[PDB]
Design a binder for this molecule. Structure first.
Ligand SMILES: [K+]
Ligand SMILES: [K+]
Ligand SMILES: [K+]
Ligand SMILES: [K+]
Ligand SMILES: [K+]
Ligand SMILES: [K+]
Ligand SMILES: [K+]
Ligand SMILES: [K+]
Ligand SMILES: [K+]
Ligand SMILES: [K+]
Ligand SMILES: [K+]
Ligand SMILES: [K+]
Lengths: 489, 489, 489, 489
């Protein structure tokens, strides 16, 4: 293995698991074993819960500004170790260094930095009732919460969940994806160095069916935040509900539509469509995988997509010049290739790509070529289902109302976007699109201030923005009676 | 039957169900059959959903002030028909006319009135990112939502759920308890009379395991709001989750503590304790069923409680002089008597009542005497478990920290309260009590402005207050890019 | 006269002034004496203040919903009396019935309705400091406030000031313009009929130099809200400050620019330009009196403006078909004609109008033709100074940056607007314009929800929207210390 | 002189004034000339304005987080240089090192730190009107603003004014008191070193009647924030209004009441009263200079006050053991002694002090002993007027309503406090006190989160808290019309 054995992080240090079992994390670019990683047992979950209960008390007893300063110190460390953490994320995920060095830690720390400054701004309400009575609310910490991460942006997701949870005075137990456990453990080390109390951010490694479920079932955990697939999310939310009625945030899957209107800058439109499909090798939840183009512009648009796709630099993600890496794992590659074969079988027209890249060293990795299908139909499997790989589906439409109806005809509702130069059309279309994250003349930017999450089966709750901080607190209403009390008895 | 057969309410009128099945609603005061009530079929659920989808479009298309005026008109009608509706609620629930004429419709309409005024104040945010880009958010309706009511405050709970739903621009399908279906239908008529579009408030009658379940499973319903038992709430929330990842509000059970500190005026304390236990014959979710009294004041406190409980006027709820009616049903009375016998068996000292009242006409109704146990212990079944009847448990303590520790030692967290004249003690204690609804020197008041709901296994989300209106909307973030777009490809 | 003598309104009824002085209000269409009106003495101001102090206590002692219901009742009465008040406003101001029946009371009551619904939403904050201390704020009424009205929209201005004042729990003494006293007295009757307590809205008639000044100087008045000219506003605000440091709102003059970009539909641009200059005969503070047109569009634009100006229906404001009435007075007309003559003297090109209309019965009124100058230059008097009459100045520009710079080159900053179909240009340009009220592809609409007021010398503070209700309260911060107190002594 | 000639700070560096004139700043402990300081000319004011205009554009063009990080860097430097700055403040003000090292920079920096984290939280609103139109607001910087500081807390006031002004994207020109000009110049160096762009914080030294007036009259400055006496504030606010209608914040004088209720612990009451009168040698605007005690507890309270006053450690402010220093200046000392003599002449009973201290080296300084008058009456000059020195007035009352009425009977309204252990009375009494800053069972703490400012003639607007940041922005409302535009012409 490249690295030493990775252990559980509980109480400000690494501790041995008690399962007697490990799993391997693999580098998807070459099949190299990166590390053996311990599996947390049911007793380890209990241990992390008790540690979080005690640690949360220390954390909540500090002043708001003391918490703020500690989180700001964590941000400073993250900025300092940006390139080091980026190199690790690239090993674990296969995403290009060009991406990890500029996105993953940058934007994860951006959100932690944002919430760090807001700790003193967490306030309740005061409501007078009459001269002799008034109400005030408190926004108290939930206590111990759990985060369950996904494998596409491991440390970014860890930061986006832990930052508001910790800013709101909670302790979080975090379970990274079995596929990508490494950077989450580094984050825990950084929080401790920054001054976060022992127990406040603990990390348990292992599978979802076990460790994830033990967390979602635990009676002392007050909230679960999960990022991953919709089918899995339903199961997680159900377990969280039936066990102890936990509060939930779910950031799930999508089949987001990008509508290119006839008055769009077509070069901007093609830049947007390729960014919305092939960044992180197509493994982004918000990807615009159904691209709607007017019939009159189909040929011109295909030419523009083809030109951009042909110059994608697929390669070793450790090369600075690479902008397109392998997929995260060999099993994920198999799944994506299955969807590609489905697309061919249902007679979608293959424009670009469509197979595994095996030339030379690439045969050692999980590389799928950027793939574009056109002449697509709404009932096709590649159009209806999330592939979570580099596969764009181009759909022809004839009128604006039709495009919007078709865009909305899905159980998903994560993101949506339009490309048009018209003031009226831009806002009117976007207001009609049923998605939580809406982009006009752009795609993919997710500022710390902007709440993001899904409509419909794409999610519950939100992340980022002021609203998310409020949602990691629970409301206590206090009525103060200053006058008489009348009983009817 | 006292009244004609009750039909479903869909699309601004009554329609025939398609189940070919009915159930009865019984007057718990005298066992009389009040009405046959139709059971909705799965197809009737589909019918109600399609009606709601279309009606919601009409409703949302109006201006905010147009919706507000219509809701304010519904309020005016509710005030005008307060006594008539109260008469009906008393028949269906057995609650005293002195309660139904003063509380049920009064406080239900108060919440509708509150939200009616806030329709034009529902706003999103705007955030500048840079000269060339900004974000704005929209708070959009969820669309079609479903409310599932409880039997203790039928029309009030219908109003507390439907008011913020409609004010936020949604359509609601409401399922009242099988035990108490009558007033929800009247509310539906009133909304139509007020100018609410057909389909915006539909009412389906039937069972929780049938009609309730079909609503929680329906993929076009975006949110479920349920009030009822904690064990039932878990199944409901899990169903809502597993099916289509619906947003959820849960207002569930409690075993709420009332702590009487030694400096308290015992007359006020006794008044609060009695009000917190025997109002609506103890059928109130927020009731202060665990009463903590200091060892030095147990005797004096018990005397003041007995004094008050003795003059409780149990009787015909049709009598204005009555302040304590029968329970809502015979099976519930059976449940309550079961707990009372458990109290006796487990060595709790019986101070008041503890028997079914069967003299004269009371034998034909479901009357349980106001019951007080004392010398209780935390391990007793009557202390640990929600009874949802007129059974007060008095517990002795020795010091403040012990009292608060014991108050918090439950899986519940709905309400909590303290009685003390000391400024420091009042706020300090209340801040440590783990409940969503906290009262100082009072009990039971639930102003429209005050968000109410449970900590822990007592709930998810809140009702009333500004925050609840917010939670019947979904956030859409719109990023407007005014400048160039850079692609890495 | 047309009506009987109008007296002061103090304490829920009309009372005799103690000045022994009266003035006449005249119908500007025909010179008819409408009424003798009493002038408040210094003694009467004192009487109004004492009445307001006592009334404010009664009003503030009610619950929020009680105040809401009373303000909602006043709205109902205003809707009922809409046509009658419009008729009165038309007599007093000379504005066409077509305008007063659809704008003045409608939009005035719209704001009162808005704030009526918001009364229960006025809340303070709660901020925890540590375990042993927390802060809550109260948003308390200021107490007695004064509003000083303008003559162009008499009752709408009375409503826009009094509505948030009363909603926030204050009493207001209102001084309508000496030119237009009639509708303010009717509003006072209406508030009383709706249930507003005696003293909460008192009306004193008379001059700005006497009565207005005595209110602005009075030490028991806590806030002054003034609408009128910038020159006068400076003096009012200075007097409010030097007397007793009152809070202030000032809605003043403007020379607002309208920029028509070359991609604008010119029919729409001309419609906007004409509406922004000739509604209420050009007597609107927010009018777009500097109209910027690109050189390439100048000729076509002038032709389209000319077409519309030619079919403007000047005439008797009593005739429902009139859409352009006389000015408010002969001295005001003389001022406007002076500006028109300056325009001619300074070589601006006269496109339309430019003189008094005297034909037949029009000689008995103060009628000025809708006037358009073109080929204007930035240093012309008509371009630099507010005319407050029906005079449009059209200015040619060559590039976007130039237009925006010239638009901003004024001491005024009330409104600004752009007409363009381009998404990026619409927002980019508007973000750069230095005005409080900005319109894209429209002009003149002022929703109750939308805060309005001036940048620079056009205003201090805002009217309408949530923010304005807040500014009719004063913040009290309350720190509750629950723990020990440490002294250095 | 102890130090070199002090210059103006404009554009990120020191520059020579163009007046040809200087003034001296004197150490009040010993009369030593600390430095000659340049007087700014009218042309220097113009230079600072032009510098601020350009600097503000650079500052506002950064992202919110870029501004946040720079202000956070300034906080870090202030923390590093706390003791250094404290020592200079002690020289310039005479305040004890024990105070300046623990309060002045600590709490000034606390507010800068608070606002630094809030920069990304400044948001506008979004309001839908109908399908075809919506409004968004922007909170834009005012531009260039000016702050005029007072002499009692020179660097803290410079920070409390500049922090929200800079955080909101403005440049500020700051004019410290002529009495204490030294630390404001150091703050300017620190902002520059932290990365604040040249011109964003400029410092001009000189008199109030000259430099202060030239700033208040300048047409390019959009807001004035002034801290000082009420009499002076009226003139400053009037000049700001009459010149160009500037926005204003005024933090002015007080005669704040402290009410000690008869259930209060007299030791705690005495600690509060002494802290509320003698901290910073009585030179605090919010001081509780009118102390109300129940008639029956006057004797006992006087003895506890006398006990603590006798042990107050008056001395050299450079001695760490000193907790009470000389007054800020010899002319201020003379004013204070004049008030003391008025107290004697009006036959208030002198309990402690009441003389200048001249023993030994104290004779070279401006030392006035801690002074306590009792048997005071409401019509005495010392009770009516702000002394701004170490002079406590003790007043006997008989009932709560009387105490409150008397507490409120003043033109001032800055602060107020009550001492009581009773829950009801604490909140009831504090709700009735007409002051913006209210303390329960404490005095003097002013957390960054807590808005502070005066009712009545003690202020306009607020400092600190979320609300203050909002008041360093101006609201722009943008209405976007997406549909048709209708003209009446
Ligand atoms: K891996
Ligand atoms: K980017
Ligand atoms: K959902
Ligand atoms: K029943
Ligand atoms: K009640
Ligand atoms: K819960
Ligand atoms: K008139
Ligand atoms: K209109
Ligand atoms: K201004
Ligand atoms: K000095
Ligand atoms: K302190
Ligand atoms: K004031």
């Amino acid at each position: 293995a490249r690295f030493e054995e990775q252990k559980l992080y509980i109480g400000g240090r690494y501790v041995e698991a008690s399962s007697g079992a490990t799993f391997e994390t693999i580098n998807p670019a070459n099949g190299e074993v990166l590390a053996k990683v311990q599996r947390a047992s049911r007793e380890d979950v209990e241990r992390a819960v008790q540690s979080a209960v005690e640690g949360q008390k220390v954390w909540a007893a500090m002043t708001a500004m003391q918490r703020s300063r500690i989180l700001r110190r964590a941000v400073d460390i993250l900025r300092e170790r940006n390139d080091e953490l980026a190199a690790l994320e690239t090993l674990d995920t296969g995403k290009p260094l060009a991406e990890t060095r500029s996105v993953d830690i940058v934007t994860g720390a951006d959100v932690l930095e944002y919430y760090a400054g807001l700790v003193p701004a967490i306030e309740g309400e005061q409501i007078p009732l009459r001269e002799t009575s008034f109400v005030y609310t408190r926004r108290e910490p939930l206590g111990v919460v759990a985060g369950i991460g996904a494998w596409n942006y491991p440390v970014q997701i860890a930061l986006w969940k832990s930052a508001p949870a910790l800013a709101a005075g909670n302790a979080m137990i975090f379970k990274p994806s079995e596929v990508t456990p490494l950077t989450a453990l580094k984050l825990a080390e950084i929080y401790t160095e920054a001054g976060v109390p022992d127990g406040v951010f603990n990390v348990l490694t292992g599978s979802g069916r076990e460790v994830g479920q033990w967390l979602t079932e635990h009676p002392l955990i007050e909230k679960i935040s999960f990022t991953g697939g919709t089918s899995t999310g339903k199961k997680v939310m159900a377990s969280a509900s039936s066990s102890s009625l936990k509060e939930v945030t779910m950031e799930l899957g999508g089949k987001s539509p990008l509508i290119i209107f006839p008055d769009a800058d077509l070069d901007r439109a093609a830049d947007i469509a390729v960014m919305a499909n092939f960044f992180s090798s197509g493994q982004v939840c918000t990807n615009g995988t159904r691209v709607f183009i007017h019939r009159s512009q189909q040929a011109r648009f295909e030419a523009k997509v083809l030109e951009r796709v042909q110059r994608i630099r697929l390669g070793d993600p450790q090369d600075e010049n690479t902008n397109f890496g392998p997929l995260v794992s060999f099993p994920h590659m198999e799944s994506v290739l299955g969807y590609i074969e489905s697309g061919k079988a249902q007679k979608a027209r293959l424009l670009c790509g469509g197979e595994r890249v095996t030339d030379g060293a690439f045969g050692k990795g999980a590389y799928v070529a950027p793939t574009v299908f056109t002449d697509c139909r709404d009932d096709m499997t590649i159009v209806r289902e999330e592939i979570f790989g580099p596969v764009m589906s181009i759909l022809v439409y004839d009128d604006e109302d039709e495009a919007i109806r078709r865009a909305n005809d899905t159980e998903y509702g994560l993101a949506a976007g339009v490309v048009t130069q018209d003031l009226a059309r831009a806002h009117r279309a976007i207001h009609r699109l049923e998605a939580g994250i809406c982009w006009i003349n752009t795609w993919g930017e997710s500022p710390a201030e902007m709440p993001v999450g899904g409509y419909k089966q794409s999610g519950v709750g939100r992340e980022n923005g002021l609203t998310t901080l409020a949602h990691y607190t629970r409301i206590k209403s206090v009525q103060v009676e200053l006058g008489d009390y009348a009983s009817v008895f």
